[PDB]
Design a protein around this motif. Structure first.
Motif, PDB file in Angstrom:
ATOM      1  N   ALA A   9     -38.301  54.713  70.813  1.00  0.00           N
ATOM      2  CA  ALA A   9     -39.233  54.491  71.957  1.00  0.00           C
ATOM      3  C   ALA A   9     -39.792  53.058  71.908  1.00  0.00           C
ATOM      4  CB  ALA A   9     -40.329  55.522  72.023  1.00  0.00           C
ATOM      5  N   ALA A  10     -40.135  52.566  70.717  1.00  0.00           N
ATOM      6  CA  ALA A  10     -40.716  51.222  70.494  1.00  0.00           C
ATOM      7  C   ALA A  10     -39.672  50.123  70.774  1.00  0.00           C
ATOM      8  CB  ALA A  10     -41.281  51.124  69.094  1.00  0.00           C
ATOM      9  N   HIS A  15     -37.603  46.247  75.042  1.00  0.00           N
ATOM     10  CA  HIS A  15     -36.471  45.788  75.895  1.00  0.00           C
ATOM     11  C   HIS A  15     -36.693  46.140  77.379  1.00  0.00           C
ATOM     12  CE1 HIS A  15     -33.872  44.197  72.842  1.00  0.00           C
ATOM     13  NE2 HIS A  15     -34.032  45.308  72.098  1.00  0.00           N
ATOM     14  N   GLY A  16     -37.907  46.522  77.780  1.00  0.00           N
ATOM     15  CA  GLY A  16     -38.340  46.628  79.189  1.00  0.00           C
ATOM     16  C   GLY A  16     -37.925  47.920  79.900  1.00  0.00           C
ATOM     17  N   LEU A  17     -37.475  48.947  79.173  1.00  0.00           N
ATOM     18  CA  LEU A  17     -36.865  50.166  79.774  1.00  0.00           C
ATOM     19  C   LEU A  17     -37.957  51.068  80.373  1.00  0.00           C
ATOM     20  CD1 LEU A  17     -33.940  50.493  80.113  1.00  0.00           C
ATOM     21  CD2 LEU A  17     -33.798  51.935  78.099  1.00  0.00           C
ATOM     22  N   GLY A  26     -40.311  58.404  78.395  1.00  0.00           N
ATOM     23  CA  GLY A  26     -39.844  59.759  78.001  1.00  0.00           C
ATOM     24  C   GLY A  26     -38.483  60.203  78.581  1.00  0.00           C
ATOM     25  N   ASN A  27     -38.122  59.833  79.827  1.00  0.00           N
ATOM     26  CA  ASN A  27     -36.778  60.055  80.450  1.00  0.00           C
ATOM     27  C   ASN A  27     -35.652  59.402  79.620  1.00  0.00           C
ATOM     28  OD1 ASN A  27     -37.087  61.426  83.290  1.00  0.00           O
ATOM     29  ND2 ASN A  27     -38.606  59.801  83.358  1.00  0.00           N
ATOM     30  N   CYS A 127     -46.315  59.055  69.015  1.00  0.00           N
ATOM     31  CA  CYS A 127     -45.941  57.645  68.741  1.00  0.00           C
ATOM     32  C   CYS A 127     -47.073  56.687  69.107  1.00  0.00           C
ATOM     33  CB  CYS A 127     -44.711  57.267  69.519  1.00  0.00           C
ATOM     34  SG  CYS A 127     -42.971  58.475  70.435  1.00  0.00           S
ATOM     35  N   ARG A 128     -47.231  55.599  68.348  1.00  0.00           N
ATOM     36  CA  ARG A 128     -48.279  54.578  68.619  1.00  0.00           C
ATOM     37  C   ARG A 128     -47.839  53.711  69.805  1.00  0.00           C
ATOM     38  NH1 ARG A 128     -52.811  54.637  65.225  1.00  0.00           N
ATOM     39  NH2 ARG A 128     -53.423  52.533  65.834  1.00  0.00           N
TER      40      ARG A 128
END
Ligand SMILES: C[C@@H](O)CN1CCN(CC(=O)O)CCN(CC(=O)O)CCN(CC(=O)O)CC1
Ligand SMILES: C[C@@H](O)CN1CCN(CC(=O)O)CCN(CC(=O)O)CCN(CC(=O)O)CC1
Ligand SMILES: [Cl-]
Ligand SMILES: [Cl-]
Ligand SMILES: [Cl-]
Ligand SMILES: [Gd]
Ligand code: NA
Length: 128
Positions: A9-10, A15-17, A26-27, A127-128
């Motif tokens: 996730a981080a 990378h801008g997703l 989350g998707n 997640c942080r």
């Protein structure tokens, strides 16, 4: 490389997703779990002779070159092997092109059948 959930996730978020073409973070983590089991080195042969590569299983029919999919396109201008790296940059830039092309995240069959209409925010919980 097999990514942990928070770690992927981080990286996707750097990378801008996150909310790219309106699709929340989350998707993307959801899709990656059911496409590859978070494994950058995953490959699957399709029956037409093309192959899916990497953490988002990107298809050699349209998107990258493996030298064994006759009269196919390479619209991300990369070797298939680049999408198997521990660095997910190649995969993320390649997925930005695919999700922009008219069909959105329906391009990913595991996204459509296992993440669309569910609580996708559950995939980044904690997640942080
Ligand atoms: C963080 C813990 O969940 C670690 N975990 C403890 C065991 N769990 C118990 C439970 O999940 O409450 C049961 C098995 N688990 C089922 C599931 O995850 O839904 C699959 C393996 N998990 C995968 C993962 O969770 O990333 C790793 C081990
Ligand atoms: C036993 C629990 O593991 C039950 N679990 C619900 C709660 N999980 C647990 C957690 O991972 O902390 C958090 C959300 N979770 C994120 C993820 O796991 O990757 C997605 C949903 N999971 C799918 C799966 O396990 O494959 C459903 C089963
Ligand atoms: Cl989300
Ligand atoms: Cl080819
Ligand atoms: Cl869309
Ligand atoms: Gd879970
Ligand atoms: Na190709």
């Amino acid at each position: 490389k097999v990514f942990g959930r928070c770690e992927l996730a981080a990286a996707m978020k750097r990378h801008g997703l996150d909310n790219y073409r309106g699709y929340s973070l989350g998707n993307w983590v959801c899709a990656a779990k059911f496409e590859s089991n978070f494994n950058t080195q995953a490959t699957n042969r399709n029956t037409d002779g093309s192959t899916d590569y990497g953490i988002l299983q990107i298809n050699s029919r349209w998107w990258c070159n493996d030298g064994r999919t006759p009269g196919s396109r390479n619209l991300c201008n990369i070797p298939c092997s680049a999408l198997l790296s521990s660095d997910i940059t190649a995969s993320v830039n390649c997925a930005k092109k695919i999700v922009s092309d008219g069909n959105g995240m329906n391009a990913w069959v595991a996204w459509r059948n296992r993440c669309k209409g569910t609580d996708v925010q559950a995939w980044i919980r904690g997640c942080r």
